[PDB]
Structure formats: C-alpha cells, structure tokens
C-alpha cells in the first residue's frame, strides 16, 4: 500500500439478499477490475429477535472516482436494487 | 430524518468473530444512546470463493461528532480489536 492523503471512495449497493449475492458474484466474476474490494453481505442489526433485518447490504471500495465511474457504466444494478455512492476520510 | 446536516461519521470494528459478536451486544445491551446503527458482521470477500476471510468487521454510525466522541469516550476497545473512524460525504 502507498499511504493515501485524502478520503478513499465507496459505494453502497442494497436490495434482497438473493440479489445482492448475486450481484456479487457478477462484478467478481465480470468487474473485478472496476472495483477495489467488495464486502460479504450485511445488514444493519435489529435490537430484538432476529438482528438480520430490512434490506441487504454491501460496501464496495474504489481506488479512485475514475475507478468509481467505470464501475458505473458497466455493471448493470438490478431492478429493486439501488446504489448510493460516498468518499470518506480517514478520522484515526 | 430532516436532511444531513453536514458530513455524517462512522466507525469500522474489527477482531474475530466472536470479538466483534461480543463487542456488537455489548454497545447495544449498554450504550444504545450513543450510536446510531450497527450492522450485522461481515467479511472481506476473498475472490478464491472463500467469503469469509481476514478480520470480521462491523460498521457503527453516529448521529453527530458529538455523539462519536462520547461513544469513544465510554466504550474501551478490546486486547486484539482495531478501531478506524472515518466521515463520508454523499457523492450521488
């Protein structure tokens, strides 16, 4: 790793589990240079009963917003999934 | 929600498994007033088809900087366990 000045780029990608997992799978099997690193599935926790609740969830990593805007040209976002892109600083 | 106001913040947590378990009921069942979300835990994906892999991590988000801080303040950080805080602003 090269020490990097500066906040690094990701996006959060949600809808199903079924699709996220295979949205997954695509861009790894198809985009795997259009990205950084993907994460395995979440979701945010529920306090009672089951914590896994509401839509899934995956972060993916860009190295740069170039990265970032390849990547959206060329991976196809299923119907009823959507994207929402951020860049982030390191804090501590 | 009203609107972002301003640049939200978040924290990464990371350990094993069970460290991360462990740590995720023990903000919930003792300091649930001062964070926002945390998700379920989640992995690095390996491309070798090994999803889980490395360090389990967890996302905690904060309603302020304010409430990070205090967050920081009152709940330690574990032998073995790493802590990153970023902030992240909206691209699209």
Redesign the interface.
Known sequence: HLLKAG?S??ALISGTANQVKCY?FRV?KNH?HRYE?????????A?NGA??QGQA?I?ITFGSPSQRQDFLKHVPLPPGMNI?????????
Chains 1, 2 share one sequence.
Do not use: H, I
């Open positions: 906040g780029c990701f997954r790894k795997r690193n993907c994460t395995t599935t979440w979701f945010t926790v306090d914590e896994r969830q972060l929402s892109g951020f860049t982030a600083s390191l804090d501590f």
